[PDB]
Design a protein around this nucleic acid. Structure first.
Length: 130
RNA sequence: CCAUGUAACAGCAGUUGAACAUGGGUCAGUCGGUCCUGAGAGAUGGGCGAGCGCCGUUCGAAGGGACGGGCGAUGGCCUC
């Protein structure tokens, strides 16, 4: 909705900075950051990448912590896995807000998808070259 | 010892093990040692001994420590 359309919810768009009522601009980033962490936190619960599932993968591969039992795998994973998804989703959402506000190429959003995937195949590229 | 995992050994076997492999576990003023000397062991003095040494353990100028006083303690500058 950029013209002749309902403007209740809309991403900010302007050269430099646009500010008439912050009750619209600051709310957009709040809903964007919260949703991203909400989406990231729920994805691991369904994609089989939570702390509980990772330990089952490591148990299957016969990998253990140095001085912990098998049951303590989950607890050490829970120290980082659940909070990394919540904070990682928040950070990647914040990068989109920074990308959108700065007005980069690609209108900010979408380049985060591009930079990650090109990095995703980078790990293949480096390991296939000794 | 504990947990996890799993040819030789456990005079049969084992999916099991004090076996093998990986990784953990023993927290003290108050429970012990540490202190005492007991039977005894054993230095120093001394004696003996070719000598390494050993006999001897009370048979030698064997005290190194005491609140109290003045020179100088003056030191905090004199309370202790």
């Amino acid at each position: 909705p950029v013209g002749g359309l309902c403007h209740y919810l809309s991403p900010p768009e302007s050269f430099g900075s646009v500010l008439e009522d912050p009750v619209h601009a600051v709310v957009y980033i709040v809903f964007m950051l919260g949703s991203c962490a909400f989406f990231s936190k729920t994805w691991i619960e369904v994609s089989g990448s939570s702390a509980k599932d990772v330990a089952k993968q490591l148990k299957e591969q016969q990998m253990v912590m140095r001085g912990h039992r098998e049951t303590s795998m989950v607890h050490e994973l829970n120290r980082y896995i659940p909070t990394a998804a919540a904070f990682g989703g928040l950070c990647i959402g914040a990068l989109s807000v920074l990308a959108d506000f700065l007005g980069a190429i690609g209108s900010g959003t979408g380049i985060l998808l591009a930079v990650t995937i090109i990095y995703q195949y980078f790990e293949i590229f480096v390991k296939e070259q000794s």
